[PDB]
RNA sequence: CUGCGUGAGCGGGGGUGGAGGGGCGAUAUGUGCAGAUCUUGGUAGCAGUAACAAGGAAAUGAUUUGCGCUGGACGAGG
């Protein structure tokens, strides 16, 4: 089908590189979120041997698998019972997710609609 | 603890918590920090360290005995 052969092209493009800020393992006041250096003596900016590597557009994914869920579908966020309506002509390419702040009274209503329409839920079986 | 994004960042799950919180378009800005012998607050190592005190005794201590030298009044100040 759609999910099964895509999940193995997705795995061919997985990188395990992280892009962590220089010296963030040495000072607690430097946070790990990425920043580019500007110093007059900076060696990360020159790409010397041994230093951490910088991010760039040559690591970006093909358009067909970028943002794919691990099971092979696209994610949609759902707040209402009326949010499921557009997922009827396409219920084999999407996987719904119920927002965190929706209460358990309304979650019963959403979970029953999606069962009688054949729509996958990434989030069901929680807070029940 | 876990998913997505080259990245700035954005989601979901289990505890805690006990009242509010968001998306999208235009618009107004006191709009993003590692440094300034930066400002204010809190906290380490140094270190239980330097420095200081432990005043002669007699089971008891209104009794016996050993040592030091300021002692008593008026004014200012309190």
From Swiss-Prot:
Parts forming coiled coils: none
Disulfide bonds: none
SMART domains linked: Ribosomal_L32e (SM01393)
Presence of the UniProt keyword Amino-acid biosynthesis in the record: no
MF annotations from Gene Ontology: structural constituent of ribosome
Keyword tags: Ribonucleoprotein, Ribosomal protein
GO CC annotations, alphabetized: cytosolic large ribosomal subunit
Pfam families, sorted: Ribosomal_L32e
GO process terms (BP): translation
Database matches in PANTHER family: 60S RIBOSOMAL PROTEIN L32 AND DNA-DIRECTED RNA POLYMERASE II, SUBUNIT N, RIBOSOMAL PROTEIN L32
Family statement drawn from the similarity comment of this UniProt entry: Belongs to the eukaryotic ribosomal protein eL32 family.
Identification of the protein by name: Large ribosomal subunit protein eL32
Species in which this protein is naturally found: Encephalitozoon cuniculi (strain GB-M1) (Microsporidian parasite)
Upper taxonomic lineage: Eukaryota, Fungi, Fungi incertae sedis, Microsporidia, Unikaryonidae
């Amino acid at each position: 089908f759609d999910p099964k052969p895509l999940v193995e092209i997705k795995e061919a493009y997985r990188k395990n590189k992280k892009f962590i800020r220089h010296h963030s393992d040495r000072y607690k006041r430097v946070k790990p979120s990425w920043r580019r250096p500007h110093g007059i003596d900076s060696k990360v900016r020159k790409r010397c041997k041994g230093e951490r590597e910088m991010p760039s557009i040559k690591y970006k994914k093909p358009k067909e698998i970028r943002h794919l869920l691990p099971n092979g579908l696209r994610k949609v966020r759902i707040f209402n019972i009326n949010d499921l309506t557009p997922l009827t002509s396409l219920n084999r390419f999407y996987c719904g997710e119920i927002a965190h702040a929706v209460g358990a009274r309304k979650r019963i209503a959403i979970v029953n609609r999606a069962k009688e329409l054949g729509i996958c839920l990434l989030n069901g079986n929680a807070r029940l």
